[PDB]
RNA sequence: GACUUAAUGUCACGGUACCCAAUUUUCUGCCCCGG
């Protein structure tokens, strides 16, 4: 007599390839998956087949359930008693069973009236098949008193349709690294989770118990069960290959990788980012467009090629098309550039009479308190049919919902239970006996569920670099990315303990994982916990219990709520099933001893807030390539799930990444102990390797995101700051070298508050805790700016708040003779002159590394004030209509003064480039920026005519010039960081009555500098660095301010906010690992003399920007305030370095230093007021004084003066040109 | 039926795809003579 019987899975069950019992021992995977669902191949080719569950496995589960049920009812079921059965086949009697039981079999007291034999037997002996005609060798199906047929899948079927190959893990508790790994085929329970078979039972005497047993089997094939009675990829890989080939024709293979990431980010922007062409077009200055999306692939641009690819691949979705194209591009870029599976003994266990076995069900929501990462292999390597990387995908199910797998949740629960108990074993994989440590005994009663989320938007991608310790730049080829689900994402957490009493340790773990009003949830599920990926908070926790000793038939009838825990969590006490009563004495964490002693002090919280008084640019490089806008650098923002809104929040939260926070702390620790300078970290017991982990041991500190909590306070949170690179010989810039960053608008009196936190392991040393707070103090002092452009002055830490739950230079330059002998100022000088430095540039291959704070070298901070001697123009070029007067005059660019959050600033890029020009001129160093590609009108280019040692330092194989050594190189971070100059005291603006904005002041037209005047013929070379005189031609501009607005066209001049002379700024120069002479030369580059000033900003040939830097304080840590005498010692030892390069310090003895200081001499600092201005173009030109003969026709003609005397008059500072 | 089990004995829910890695380095939004 047969019954048909269907078993339904409710989580992804495990599938293995079917092998027969003799050939099953050859493969370790099938030895592992004896208890799994088997998969055989219907035809040849190893691509299609049939899945089934063996009847021996279902019979093993039913017999285990029968043992548990008869132990719960003390050997009886519905009146008829059962004996203890048999589980000991003698080898002398016959062949052993194919599966030998290793567990502790539950054996009760046998109270049957008669012994069990062929004529009469108990339901235990009958369901076991003790006394039937069937045996170890199967002949016919009619010899079975009880028969379990194979359970065939109820739905040719291919393996890739049903299963996904997944690598599991075995993480060591002491080290945190996986000891080994193994593979399963996690099969789709939603489509192929129903398996139908037949059970043939002959006599009815063991019938009802069997219908009990089908209601009591909770596990088959690695999943929860209810058992009831009754090609685009090939063509896209080809097109990605031809895209990689077209990029390799341009030698842009290294961009292909980030292109893959860019395409893998395009799934977050929908179809319209390609259909409506919202890809960035690149800067309009460069005629070639975008550096990535306008690359010609087979004659057409990459944006239109991607349009054609999407139009050819509209059959698959946009997410699948972008994921497959980015995966193919990453795989082609990767191509072009341990595994462990697995004396019989019968162990009877008799529980005491009167004991109460119960089943606790703990249901809750597993909210992601942090962005989470559950690791999976690449889908090219995770093919179930066919069986180092740098791009890592998060784990998803068949419909791209995020999942917490049962294995990862179970391993994290095992780790936390090993923490809660004092002791714990490492899980042996082939023990014939059960492990007797407390963690294994408690987790043998614990069952969980594979959680999946109701949210399926694509993961954010976290991009990560390793900084080179020596150069403090990105290590080449070390960029790698992972995929994160958002924080706030909730997962249905299911736990089920099957035991006599609920353990104190597991309740301590559940209170440890749960979040409260003053407690953080602490379920570290997933990967990269060191970067704080996957800290989950348990919430909405409800525990109920089935009292299985007396209320067992309605545990069987409801099947333990094994498919409706989602129903169980929402619904309340009134609709609860019979036998399932809520759990009242779940003990709180205030009196749970293994929580308070072992779990609560295990990870100590240090939460703090970083006040950043600078703009903050943690660059999202891929997001600059996918989001619309022409910004090369935008701040990092991340997607955060809102559980209340059940969606991603519409505003992304700006944050400094937890990996950036972790790396900042890691270099802060490793620099103070010198552990960053180690060439390798393998089996290292260094302080940085103990605290932050290595490739063999996990980190004992965990870092979360520095989330910006101040972002609602700023009116415009993202400030636009556009920088440009200034040529050294032409005073203008290069349009192709312009780059605009988009940092967060941070500033001194309106700082960015960044809420970050890190967790410390229990057992930190007295030393290592002091290293951690010393790293925190180093960040607090401002040693480590956050994000990019730290040398430019971005992301500077003004301070750190810890939560309660945790001089003048006395040198006077003589100047030039002609302005001092001209009291009436009838001489007219050129607005710029060229520093006549030779071709000798000293280069050092002994490059000072950034990996440690060297004792003999000097590191500190210079507090400098900045006094404007003439009015200063630092334009805010983000708004080309910052003064709002383009409506009256179209095309007339008008800028405000540079300001972040209303308060007035000078960027440290301007100060840094100015001091870089002064230091490069001071040290006779290389022309670090030059227009190589420009031609004159001629046989050679501009860069060809420049000297070879005057060329910019490219790479660190050759030496670096002192300007390139101090301020940096593309391959080497600079050792000086120039802060943004805040404004304190002065007259603020230069008010002029003729202007409609009295703050503003229009200047003359600023045309491009002409090297044809400076280099007249082919024989003349580059004369030198162009510097501008310190004069008061701004007074001349102010006098003819009425005439300027009509004599020239509006689209040729600019009207800008102008800060008056006498204004005081304050800026910090944080210097790092400088020599004794380098600090002195830098301090001399700040304050060169009594009558020496500096020129920065717009209007330098017009007299604007004459600024005086004087130093209040030099602070040096090894923290102390350096006195005046040691400052003079540093400056004097820099002076001796200048003499040994040339071969009270008197600077004018050095000829090029004398010429540079004469260029930067201030004649009006006295009664001198020289009028210097450019000559007019012709005799009939505007602003020409008649009889002066100061037209450009006179100086341009070689008959009036020779070419060489014009070059000599351009190289002589303050030489009279009239 | 068979693909596809063996039946007096399947802890495989017996195993966290773990572990390490600062998307940053460099760059004054600058400016005068020809056609
Ligand atoms: Mg039998
Ligand atoms: Zn019996
Ligand atoms: Zn154990
Ligand atoms: Zn180390
Ligand atoms: Zn250089």
Automatic annotation (TrEMBL):
Residues given in the record as Zn(2+) 4 binding sites: 116, 125
Residues that bind Zn(2+) 11: 689
Residues that, per the record, bind Zn(2+) 8: 681, 684, 686, 689
Binding sites annotated in the UniProt record for Zn(2+) 1: 83, 115-116
Protein's recorded name: RAMP superfamily protein
Binding site for Mg(2+) 1: 129, 132
Binding-site positions, Zn(2+) 2: 83, 116
Disulfide linkage: 83-122, 425-437
Binding of Zn(2+) 9, residues: 681, 686
Residues the entry annotates as binding Zn(2+) 3: 83, 116, 122, 125
Binding site for Zn(2+) 10: 684, 689
Binding site for Mg(2+) 2: 129, 132, 134
Residues given in the record as Zn(2+) 5 binding sites: 122, 125
Residues annotated as binding Zn(2+) 7: 440
Domain CRISPR type III-associated protein positions: 396-536, 609-797, 865-933, 962-1108
């Amino acid at each position: 007599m047969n019954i048909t019987v269907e078993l339904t899975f409710f989580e992804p069950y495990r599938l293995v390839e079917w092998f027969d019992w003799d050939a099953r021992k050859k493969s370790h995977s099938a030895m592992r998956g004896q208890a799994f669902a088997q998969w055989t191949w219907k035809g040849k080719g190893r691509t299609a087949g049939k899945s089934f569950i063996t009847g021996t496995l279902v019979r093993s589960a039913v017999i285990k359930a029968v043992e548990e049920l008869l132990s719960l009812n003390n050997g009886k079921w519905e009146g008829v008693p059962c004996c203890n059965g048999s589980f000991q086949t003698d080898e002398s009697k016959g062949k052993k069973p194919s599966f030998l039981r290793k567990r502790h079999t539950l054996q009760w007291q046998a109270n049957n009236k008669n012994i069990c034999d062929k004529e009469e037997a108990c339901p235990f002996c009958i369901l076991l098949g003790r006394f039937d005609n069937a045996g170890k060798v199967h002949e016919r199906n009619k010899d079975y008193d009880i028969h379990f047929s194979n359970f065939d899948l109820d739905h040719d079927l291919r393996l890739v349709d049903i299963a996904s190959g997944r690598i599991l893990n075995r993480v060591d508790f002491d080290t945190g690294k996986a000891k080994d790994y193994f593979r399963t085929w996690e099969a789709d329970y939603e489509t192929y989770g129903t398996y139908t078979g037949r059970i043939t039972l002959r006599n009815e005497h063991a019938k009802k118990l069997l219908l009990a047993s089908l209601g009591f089997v909770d596990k088959l094939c690695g999943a929860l069960c209810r058992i009831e009675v009754i090609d685009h990829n090939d063509e896209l890989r080809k097109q990605a290959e031809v895209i990689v080939e077209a990029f390799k024709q341009n030698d842009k293979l290294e961009k292909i990788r980030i292109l893959a990431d860019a395409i893998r980010t395009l799934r977050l922007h929908g179809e319209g980012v390609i259909e409506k062409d919202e890809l960035p077009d690149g800067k309009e200055e460069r005629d070639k467009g975008h550096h990535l999306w306008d690359i010609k692939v087979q004659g057409t641009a990459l944006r239109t090629k991607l349009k054609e690819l999407w139009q050819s691949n509209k059959d698959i979705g946009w997410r699948k098309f972008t994921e497959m194209l980015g995966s193919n591009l990453y795989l082609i870029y990767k191509k072009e550039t341990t595994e462990y599976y697995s004396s019989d003994l019968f162990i009877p266990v008799t529980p005491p009479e009167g004991i109460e076995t119960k089943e606790w069900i703990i249901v809750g929501r597993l909210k992601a308190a942090t962005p989470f990462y559950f690791g999976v292999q690449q889908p090219s390597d995770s093919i179930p049919g066919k069986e180092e990387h740098t791009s890592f995908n998060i784990l998803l199910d068949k419909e791209n919902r995020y999942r917490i797998p049962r294995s990862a949740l179970r391993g994290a629960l095992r780790r936390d239970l090993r923490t809660a108990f004092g002791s714990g074993c490492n899980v042996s994989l082939g023990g014939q006996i059960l492990c007797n440590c407390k963690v294994c005994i408690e987790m043998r009663r614990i069952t969980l569920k594979d959680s999946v989320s109701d949210f399926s938007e694509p993961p954010e991608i976290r991009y990560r670099i390793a900084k080179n310790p020596g150069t403090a730049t990105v290590e080449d080829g070390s960029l790698f990315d992972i995929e994160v689900g958002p924080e706030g994402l909730t997962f249905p957490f299911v736990l089920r303990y099957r035991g006599h009493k609920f353990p104190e340790q597991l309740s301590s773990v559940i209170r440890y994982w749960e979040e409260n009003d003053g407690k953080n949830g602490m379920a570290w599920l997933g990967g990269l916990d060191s970067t704080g990926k996957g800290r989950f908070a348990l919430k909405d926790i409800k525990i109920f219990e089935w009292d299985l000793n007396q209320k067992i038939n309605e545990y069987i009838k409801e099947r333990g709520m094994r498919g409706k825990e989602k129903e169980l969590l929402e619904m309340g006490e009134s609709s609860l099933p019979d036998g399932l009563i809520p759990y009242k004495f779940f003990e709180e964490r205030e009196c749970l001893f293994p929580y308070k002693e072992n779990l609560k002090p295990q990870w100590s919280e240090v939460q703090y807030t970083i006040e950043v008084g600078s703009p903050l640019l943690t660059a999202d490089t891929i997001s600059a390539l996918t989001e619309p806008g022409n910004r090369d650098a935008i701040a990092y923002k991340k997607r955060v799930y809102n559980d209340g809104n059940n969606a991603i929040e519409p505003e992304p939260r700006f944050a400094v990444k937890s990996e950036t926070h972790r790396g900042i702390f890691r270099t802060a620790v490793g620099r103070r102990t010198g552990d960053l300078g180690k060439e390798d970290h393998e089996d290292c017991t260094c302080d940085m390797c103990i605290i932050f982990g290595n490739e063999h041991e996990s980190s004992k500190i965990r870092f979360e995101d520095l989330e910006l909590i101040n972002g609602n306070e700023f009116e415009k949170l993202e400030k636009h700051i556009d920088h440009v690179a200034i040529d050294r010989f032409t005073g203008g810039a290069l349009d192709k070298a312009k780059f605009d960053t988009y940092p967060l608008a941070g500033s001194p009196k309106k700082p960015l508050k960044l809420k970050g936190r890190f967790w410390i392991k229990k057992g930190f040393s007295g030393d290592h805790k002091l290293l951690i707070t010393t790293a925190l103090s180093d960040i607090r002092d401002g040693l480590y700016p956050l994000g990019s452009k730290g040398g430019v002055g971005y992301g500077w830490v003004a301070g750190i708040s810890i939560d309660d739950n945790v001089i003048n230079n006395d040198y006077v330059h003589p100047g030039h003779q002609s302005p001092k002998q001209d009291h009436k100022n009838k001489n007219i000088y050129y607005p710029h002159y060229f520093l006549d430095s030779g071709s000798k540039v000293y280069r050092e291959k002994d490059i000072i590394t950034h990996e440690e704070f060297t004792e003999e070298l000097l590191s500190g901070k210079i507090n400098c004030k900045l006094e404007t001697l003439t009015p200063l123009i630092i334009p805010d070029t983000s708004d080309e209509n910052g003064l709002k007067l383009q409506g009256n005059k179209p095309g007339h660019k008008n800028y405000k003064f540079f300001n972040i959050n209303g308060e007035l600033m000078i960027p440290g890029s301007e100060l840094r480039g100015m001091l870089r020009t002064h230091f490069e001129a001071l040290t006779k160093s290389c022309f670090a920026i030059f227009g190589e590609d420009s031609t004159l009108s001629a046989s050679k280019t501009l860069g060809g005519k420049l000297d070879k040692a005057l060329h910019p330092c490219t790479g660190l194989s050759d030496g670096l010039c002192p300007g390139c050594h101090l301020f940096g190189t593309t391959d080497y971070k600079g050792r000086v960081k120039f802060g943004f100059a805040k404004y304190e005291n002065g007259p603020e603006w230069l008010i002029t009555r003729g202007n409609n904005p009295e703050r503003s002041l229009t200047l003359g037209v600023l045309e491009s500098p002409r090297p044809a005047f400076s280099i007249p013929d082919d024989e003349s070379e580059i004369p030198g660095r162009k510097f501008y005189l310190h004069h008061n031609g701004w007074r001349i501009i102010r006098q003819k301010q009425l005439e300027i607005r009509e004599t020239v066209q509006p689209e040729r001049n600019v009207t800008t906010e102008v800060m008056d002379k006498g204004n005081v700024f304050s800026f910090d120069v944080r210097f790092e690992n400088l020599r004794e002479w380098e600090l002195g030369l830098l301090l001399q580059s700040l304050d060169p003399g009594k009558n020496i000033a500096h020129k920065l900003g717009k209007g330098k040939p017009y007299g604007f920007g004459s600024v005086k830097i004087k130093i209040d304080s030099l602070h040096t840590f090894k923290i102390k305030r350096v006195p005046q005498s040691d400052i003079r010692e540093y400056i004097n030892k820099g002076y001796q370095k200048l003499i040994e390069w040339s071969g009270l310090p008197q600077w004018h003895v050095i000829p090029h230093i004398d010429k540079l200081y004469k260029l930067l001499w201030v004649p009006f600092l006295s009664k001198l007021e020289p009028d210097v201005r450019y000559p007019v173009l012709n005799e009939e030109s505007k602003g020409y004084i008649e009889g002066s003969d100061y037209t450009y026709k006179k100086l341009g003609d070689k008959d009036n003066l020779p070419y060489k005397t014009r070059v000599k008059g351009l190289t002589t500072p303050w030489s009279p040109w009239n």
